[PDB]
Design a binder for this molecule. Structure first.
Ligand SMILES: Cc1c(Cc2ccccc2)c(=O)oc2cc(OS(C)(=O)=O)ccc12
Ligand SMILES: Cc1c(Cc2ccccc2)c(=O)oc2cc(OS(C)(=O)=O)ccc12
Ligand SMILES: Cc1c(Cc2ccccc2)c(=O)oc2cc(OS(C)(=O)=O)ccc12
Lengths: 494, 494, 494, 494
C-alpha cells in the first residue's frame, strides 16, 4: 500500500528551535532551500551561526543541570517520551515522507515505505533501552563497595547529513535522548525542513525545553561552531571522511570533546563462483544504486570470480538499463536527482576519469534532463584498482565491476583502502562465508545480501570510515559517561 | 615484609625492542637517563625516532596479519602468556622495584609493595578477560542471522608516563594484548628502563615476535611519530591535558586513529562537618602527597565545612611536617625527589604564585638539599578559587585547603574546572554520599576514602581529564573493534 | 486524580480462552466467583480441569512450532504487540480496576493508582526487552566458530495468585511473551475475572492464536494438571511455600520441567537507634498492612533497637488505629476484607496464638462487620521468636514488633527462618546500611524504605521464599533456553 | 608426546575430606574400589553416609558465614587459589591421569592428553571469572538508588559421575568456588580416588577449611543425604535422567534447594547428501564411541540421507572394526572396558533387543575377554525409531545408523525424544546449517563436527537432558543468588 497526501504540502516550520520555541537568527539572515529535482527554491529558513549555536548550548546546558526535569525524571519516562515521538511521526508519516522526498530528491515510495518506517522503528527501539541502561557492582580488591553509574555525557552536538535526513536525525537523537543527554542538532544546509517538523513534534510530545534544540544553517559556520565549542561535551557527525578529520581535529584543539564519526566508504563485494548469481546481481545492484548512490555503504567495488564475471556484468548492465528518471514524487519514477551542484559536478568529473583511464562503459556516463541534478545510471566493467573510480567515493549512481581469480589476492584488494565501512560476500559455502567475513576490514559484513541495516545492529566503520558505533546495545555506550563510585566499608563480604 | 636486592643493580637492557630482538637506533644516537635524586647519569639508551617507530609499526602490522600466530592462537593462550608475564615480573620483583625506584625517584617501599603488586595483579586480571571477550547474537528485523565479533583493533600505539612507569605500561599493554592487539610502546624519555626489562620478559614468556615492540625516546619526535602515523589504528596516552590535545588533534589530521587519553586533574574533596575527621585528614593528605604529588588524581583542592575547617587545617599541617626527604632507596626515607627540572621549576613557580596571591602558607614553600629535585612538602590554607594554585595542576607536593559553608555552592566550585578526573566526599550520611557523588563531574568519586584504584574498576576522566576508560570490564571495550555480520537466511525462528 | 466508572460493571468474559476463542469446559461444569466484601456470588465461570489444560497445551505447542507466526515474527513485533496490550489495558483502566477491586477485595484507589499503573508500566518495560534479548559469540579453543542463541523455552504454565491478579498475570506473561514463549495461564480460583478480560484484549491486540491461553479453575485439579504435564516446558508459580514444594516435586516426577517459584516470607525490618523514626514507622506500617497484609513481602517482623522501642510501638499503634473498614469501592474506605474463609480462619487462628503465647496486644485482635472477611488491624508488641506469630506467615493485617540491643544478634534473628523474600534496614549510617544489607539472607533489601518494587528490578527469594528471579534484566534469563552452536572452520582469527 | 609414570602408583588418599583434614566414617565402614579392566580390588575407601554428609555441611555452612576468610577475601584471591590448584594438578598430571585410567577404565592417552588438559584449562578459565562476577546499578522508577549483588548461593552439594571423574569434579567445583560458594562433593562410588587426591591439593593450595569437603560413598545413601538435606542451598548432579528426577523431586520435598542437572541423551546427527562424507563419518564415529560410549552426548542416532546411506554405513563399519581392546594403561590399546557390571548388563541387554527387533548388525554384538567389562564395538544399520536401541541411552560402544530422504521429517524424528542434550548437522550449505541447528531441540548443536566442548561454551540440555547450563559466562549465573538493594534518596539524577 502506497497512500499519498491529499493536499499541497505547506512549509510551516522554518525557524531555529531552542527551549521549545521558535527563534529568528541573531543576524536576521535567512538562507534558501531548494528542490534538487526542479532547482527551484522551496522556501527560506533562518540561518544559524556561532552566535545561535551559543544560545542553543546554554539551553542544553541548563536542561542538563542536576535537579532539572530531564535529569530527575524516571528513565522509563524518557522512554515514554521517545515512544510518544514515534507515534507522532507515525501520525505525520504522509506529510513527512512528502517533505523528505521533495526536499532531499528522494523517491517517495522509498521515503514513505523505508525511511519513515526505519525512523519510527528506530525510535521505538531506542525508547526501550532507556530504563535498561545499567552500571555495575564490582568486587574490587580491599574493603570497599564499588559501583558504576552509566550517566549521560551531557550536551551533545549532532551534525546530520542530507542523504537520509530523518533516519539520521533519529539515529542520532534516539540514543542520545534515551541515555539522558541533551542535544544541539545541526541539520544539513540542503535538508533542514523535516528536522524542523520533528522539533514541532518534540514540543508536542512534551520533552522538557532545551532537551532538543535544532539549529539549521551552514557547516563551516554553525557546524564549526559546534565542533569547536568549549561547553559541548560530545560531537556526532555523519558525512565525508574529509570533513570528519576537520571535526576530530577541532575537538582536540578546543575542549577534548568526545567524538563519533560515521563517514564515507569504498565498500567491496566479493562474489564467489559458487554464489547464487541472480541473488548476488540483485543485491550488488541495489547495493550501489540505492538513493541515487548517495549511501555511505555504497557497494562501489564489486569483485567477481573470473568464470562468472562476464555473466555477472551482462545481468548487472541489464538491470541498470531499467530506470525511469524524473520527479521523486511521480508514481512509477525509479530514479531521482542527486542532491546538489557540488555533488553533481564531482560525480560527472569522476565518470570522466572512468572513461579517460580506460574502464569499459557498459551504460550511462552522462547527465539527464533540462533541470534537476540527474545523472544517468552508469556501469563500468574491467575496472582496475588504481583507477579513480576504484579509489574515490563517488556518492553517485555509478557501479564498478572487476574480476578476480585468487581469493587471497582479492581479499587484499578489498582491504587495500583507507575506508572500511562495509562489505559483501556471496557464496553458498559455510567455511568461506565465515573466514572471508572475518578477514575483511569492514564494520559490517553482509553474507548473501547487502545494505541490511536495523536498529538492533550496531553500525560504523573500520579505519577512516568512522570512529565508534551507532545503535544496537553497543552504540548506546557512546552516549554514556562512566563514573566509578568507591565507598570505604568496615568489611566486605562476597 | 620489605625484602631488598643483595647485589648492585646492573643495567642490562638499553636497546629498542622490535620483533623480539634488540635494535640500535636508525640514527645511532643514544640519549642519557638520570637519577632524579642524585642528578647523575645512570646510563644511555638507544634513541628512537620516526624512522624507528616505522620499523616497529611494520612489525606490529605483520604480527597482526590474518593467519598469524597471534591472530590464530586460542584466546585462552593469549591469557596464558599474560599470566606467564605476570609470574616473570613477580620473579623479578626486587630487581624491577629497585630499577623503578632508582630511575623514577620513587620510594622503594612504595615501588616494591604498591607499584609492583598492582602491576602483577593487573596483569593477572587482564589475563582472565582474554577468552571472555564476546560478541552478540542479535534478533535483527527480517530473515537474517546477525552476530557480532569484538575483534582486536590492530596496531595500538601506547605512550607511557614517567610517574608510574611499570603500572601504566601494564595498564596499557595488559588490555591491549588480552583483546588480541599488537602494540608499539613509547616509554617516557625520563623512565625507559623498567619497560625495556619487561620487554626481555615478554620475549622469555614466548609472545610471538612483533606483538610487543618498545621504542624509547622523546615525545616530540617518537611520540609525534606515533600520534601522526598512517598505519597505527589507535593511540593511548597518559599525561598532561596540554599534550593530550596535541595527540587528539594529530590523530584527526593523519588517519582518524582511535584515541583514548588519561590526563591531568584538579580533583576536589568535599569534607562535611559530620565526617570522621581523622579519616578525612589522612586520606586527603595521602591523596595529594602520594609519590611527591605526581599523581593525575592528586586531591589538589580540599573543601572543608567551616565549623571543622580550622581543626582540619591544623591536623593536616601536623601530618605534612612529618616527612623525611632523601634517597628513595634508603629505608626510613618518606619523600623522594620530583622527576626532573622542567617539573621542579613549574612547581616552584606555582608555589611562588601561592605566596604572591596571598594564600596562607602553613609549612614548606621552598626547595631542599644540594642535589636531587626535592621540594619541601607544602600546605596552603585560605586558598581561593581564582588563585593559580587552585586552578593549575601542580604535580608537586603542595596541598590546598579551602573553606565552605554552603553545600550547593561548594559542589559548583568543585565542578567549576575543565578537569574532572576524580573527587572525594567525606560524610557519614547515606543520602549526602549518594547525592553528592552523583552531582560531581568526576570519573571516579571516592566516599570516605581517596586514591583507591584497582584492575576491577574502570578509570578515566570527565571533561578535559580524558577520553575513554581503562581497565574493568568497560575499559576492555576500547581495545576492540566491533564487526557486525548479517547473513541472509530462508527463514528465521526465535 | 481518582476518576471512576460511570456505569454498573457488567461481567462479559467468563469462558476458557484457547486459540483466541472462548471455550466451555470439557465437563460443562462451572464454578462460582464471590465478592469477599459481601460474600455474594458475582457470577459463574467455566471450570477448567486436566482435560482442558490438555487442549490449552496443544494450542500452545502448535503456536510454538518452528515456522509459526509467533516463532518467525520479528522480535520487535513481539514488542509492538506487548505495547499494544499495554495501551489497551490503559484504555480499560477504569473497568479493570473496578473489576479488580470488586473481585479481589482490593481498595479501588490502590487498584486504580497502583495495581493498574504497575501493570501498564511493567508491560511497557517488557515490550522493550523483546528485540534486546541476545546471545553471544564466543572465542572457544580450537578452530571453531561458536555462538549462542537465547531461545524461548517453549510452553510455559503460569499459575497466578489472588492477591495481585492483574499485576502478577503481567509479571508472568510480559517476560514470557517478550522472550517468545507461549503460555497456559491458570488464574486463581478466587480471582479469574480480570485475566479473562485481559485475554479479550490479547485477542484485540492481534497476538497469534495459541500464544496466550487462559484456563480458569481450581489448583488441585487444573494447577496439578499444569505442574505434572508431560509437554509443558516450564512452570511459574506465586503462592504459599507449602504449595511451592508440591509444584517443584511434581515437575521432578513428570518431565523435569523448569521451575520458578515466588513464595511466602517472614520478612524482617531492623530499625537502628539512629534511624529517622517517623520514616521508619511509616514504611514499616505500610510495609505490613498493605492490601490487608496479603503481601508475600509483608514486613511481619519489626526489630527495633531498645532505646527507641517504646516510642516506635506507640507511634505504630497510633497509625494502626486510623483505619476505616468497609467496601473497597466506597471512597474514604482505607481497609478492605481478606480474600476468603480459608484465609480468614488461619489469620484469626494465628491472632489467637498471639494472645495465648503472651504477646502484648496493642490494638485489634478480632473480626469486624456482619459480612465480608474483615479483620481488625492488629498490633502485637513484646513478640518473641518462638511465638507462632513470629514464625508463620499470617497473610493478614497483623504487625509484630520486637526489641533488640545487639546488632550481631538481631541479624541472626532476622536470618533465623527458612523464608528470605525481603528485608528492611533503617539507619542514617553509610557503613551499617551496606554491611547489614549484605549480611541479610533476603532477595530484596530496602534501606530507609520498604515495599519498593518496579519492573527494572529483579525480584525473588532466598531460601524457601522462592527459586529464580522475575523482572529486571536478570529475570528475563529464566524465560530463555540457551543453545550453543559450534561450527568447524578451516582457521579462526581473533 | 605421551610421557608416563616411572613408578607404581600408590594409593595414598582414601579418607573423607572435611575442614582440610581426613576423617574415618562415622560408622567406621569402608567400601571397595575396583579396576573395571581386571575386576580386581584396588583399595578400600571410607564410606560416607547421612551422618558424614551432616559433618561436611556444617563445615561448609561455617566456612560460608559472613565474616569468614572465604567470604571476606578479595575475589581476585579466590581466583588466585583456583589458578594455584590448576598448577598443582598440572604438577601431578602423570599421577592423576594414571589413577584416572586405572580406576575409571579410561584410555591413558585420553586421560593424559584430553581429560587432564581440559581439567587444567577449565580451572584456569574459572579462576579468571572470579573478580569479574558483577551486579548492576539500575534506573528504578522513583527517588531511589538500586543496585544488585550477585552473591554466592551458599552450601552447594555436588554429585559427580564416574565417566569423567576429574573433568566433572572441576566443571562443578571451578564455577562454584569462583563465585564464592562452599561445596560438599560426592564423587561416584566407582571412582572416588582422583577426587580425594584433588582434595589433598586443595589443602596444599591453601583454600580455607570447609570451603571444599569431599564425601565418598554410595548414591542412595550419601547422594540422597545431599539431595534431601535441609541446610544445603543447591544441588548439582550429572548422571542418568532417571536419577535426575529423584534428585529434583527430593529438593522439592525437603527445602526447595536450587537444582541443576546434566543428564542423559539420545543425541542425533543429520548428515546431508552434500556433506563432506569422510569428515561426517569420522566425527559421527568418534561421536558415539568415545570413552567406550560412556558419554552423555553420545551421537547415538545417525540419520543419513538415502543417496549416501550405503557408503556412510560401509565406511563407518570399517572404522569400527579397527579397535584394539585391552588394558587402558598399555600403549596401542584403543578401547578399554565399561565401568561396571550394572552398566555391562544393560548394554548387552540393549544389544540383544537390537538383534531381536531386527536391526542389521554390521559388526560386534557380544562381549570380549575373560575379565574386564569389555563389549565389542558394535554397529547397527537399518535401525528404526521404535527400536529400543533408537530410544534408550545405551551408554555403551554401540552405534545406530538410519536413513532419511525428507529433511522436514528427519528433523521431527531427531526431535521426537524426551532427551535433548546435543545434536550434529553435516552439510556445506550455509542456509541449511543455520536453519537446521535452529530447529533442533538440543542444547548444543555441532555443525560439521561433534563432541567439541570447552570452558568458554555453556553446556546443558533441553528437555529431560537437564536443567541449567554449566560453564561459559552463562553457567556462572547458576552459582549466584541475586540480591536487590533499594535505597531511598532525597532526589535521583540520571
Ligand atoms: C597507583 C596510584 C596512581 C596511578 C594510577 C591511577 C589510575 C589508575 C592506575 C594507576 C595515582 O595516580 O595515585 C595514587 C595515589 C595513591 O595514594 S592515595 C591517593 O591512596 O593516598 C596510591 C596509589 C596511586
Ligand atoms: C505491588 C506490591 C506487591 C506485589 C508484588 C511483589 C513483588 C513483585 C511485584 C508485585 C506486594 O507484595 O506488596 C506491596 C506492598 C506495598 O506497600 S508498601 C510495602 O510499599 O508499604 C506496595 C505495593 C506492593
Ligand atoms: C570431554 C568429553 C565429554 C564430557 C563432557 C561433556 C560436557 C561438558 C564437559 C565434559 C563427553 O561426554 O564426550 C566427549 C566426547 C568426545 O569425543 S568426540 C564426540 O569429540 O569424538 C571427546 C570429549 C568428550
Amino acid at each position: 500500500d502506497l497512500p499519498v497526501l491529499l493536499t499541497d504540502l505547506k512549509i510551516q516550520y522554518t525557524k531555529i528551535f531552542i527551549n521549545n520555541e521558535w527563534h529568528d537568527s541573531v543576524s536576521g539572515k535567512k538562507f534558501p532551500v531548494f528542490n534538487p529535482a526542479t532547482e527551484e527554491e522551496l522556501c527560506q529558513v533562518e540561518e544559524g551561526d556561532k552566535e545561535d549555536v551559543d544560545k542553543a548550548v546554554k539551553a542544553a546546558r541548563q536542561a542538563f543541570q542536576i535537579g532539572s526535569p530531564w535529569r530527575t525524571m524516571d528513565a522509563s519516562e524518557r522512554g515514554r517520551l521517545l515512544y510518544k515521538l514515534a507515534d507522532l511521526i507515525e501520525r505525520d508519516r504522509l506529510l513527512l515522507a512528502t517533505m523528505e522526498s521533495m526536499n532531499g530528491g528522494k523517491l517517495y515510495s522509498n521515503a514513505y515505505l523505508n525511511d519513515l518506517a526505519g525512523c519510527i522503528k528506530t525510535l521505538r527501539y531506542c525508547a526501550g533501552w532507556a530504563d535498561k541502561i545499567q552500571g555495575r557492582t564490582i568486587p574490587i580488591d580491599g574493603n570497599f563497595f564499588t559501583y558504576t553509574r552509566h550517566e549521560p555525557i551531557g550536551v551533545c552536538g549532532q551534525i546530520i547529513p542530507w542523504n537520509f535526513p530523518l533516519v539520521m536525525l533519529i539515529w542520532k537523537i534516539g540514543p542520545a535522548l534515551s541515555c539522558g543527554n541533551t542535544v544541539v542538532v545541526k541539520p544539513a544546509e540542503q535538508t533542514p525542513l523535516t528536522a524542523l517538523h520533528v522539533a514541532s513534534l518534540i514540543k508536542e510530545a512534551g520533552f522538557p525545553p532545551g532537551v532538543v534544540n535544532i539549529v539549521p544553517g551552514y557547516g563551516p559556520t554553525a557546524g564549526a561552531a559546534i565542533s569547536s565549542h568549549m561547553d559541548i561535551d560530545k560531537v556526532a557527525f555523519t558525512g565525508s571522511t574529509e570533513v570528519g578529520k576537520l571535526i576530530k581535529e577541532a575537538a582536540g584543539k578546543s575542549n577534548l570533546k568526545r567524538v563519533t564519526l560515521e563517514l564515507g566508504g569504498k565498500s567491496p563485494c566479493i562474489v564467489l563462483a559458487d554464489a547464487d548469481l541472480d541473488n548476488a546481481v540483485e543485491f550488488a545492484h541495489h547495493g550501489v544504486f540505492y538513493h541515487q548512490g548517495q549511501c555511505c555503504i555504497a557497494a562501489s567495488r564489486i569483485f567477481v570470480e573470473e568464470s562468472i564475471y562476464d555473466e555477472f556484468v551482462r545481468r548487472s548492465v541489464e538491470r541498470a538499463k531499467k530506470y525511469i528518471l524524473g520527479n521523486p514524487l511521480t508514481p512509477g519514477v525509479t530514479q531521482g536527482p542527486q542532491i546538489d551542484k557540488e555533488q553533481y559536478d564531482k560525480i560527472l568529473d569522476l565518470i570522466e576519469s572512468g572513461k579517460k583511464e580506460g574502464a569499459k562503459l557498459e551504460c550511462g556516463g552522462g547527465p539527464w534532463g533540462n533541470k534537476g541534478y540527474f545523472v544517468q545510471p552508469t556501469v563500468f566493467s574491467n575496472v582496475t584498482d588504481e583507477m579513480r573510480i576504484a579509489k574515490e567515493e563517488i556518492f553517485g549512481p555509478v557501479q564498478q565491476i572487476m574480476k578476480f581469480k585468487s581469493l587471497d589476492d582479492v581479499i587484499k584488494r578489498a582491504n587495500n583502502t583507507f575506508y572500511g565501512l562495509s562489505a559483501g560476500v556471496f557464496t553458498k559455502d559455510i567455511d568461506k562465508a565465515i573466514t572471508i567475513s572475518s578477514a575483511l576490514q569492514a564494520g559490517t559484513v553482509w553474507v548473501n545480501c547487502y545494505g541490511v541495516v536495523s536498529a538492533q545492529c550496531p553500525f560504523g566503520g573500520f579505519k577512516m570510515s568512522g570512529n565508534g558505533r551507532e545503535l544496537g546495545e553497543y552504540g548506546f555506550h557512546e552516549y554514556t559517561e562512566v563514573k566509578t563510585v568507591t565507598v570505604k566499608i568496615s568489611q566486605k563480604n562476597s
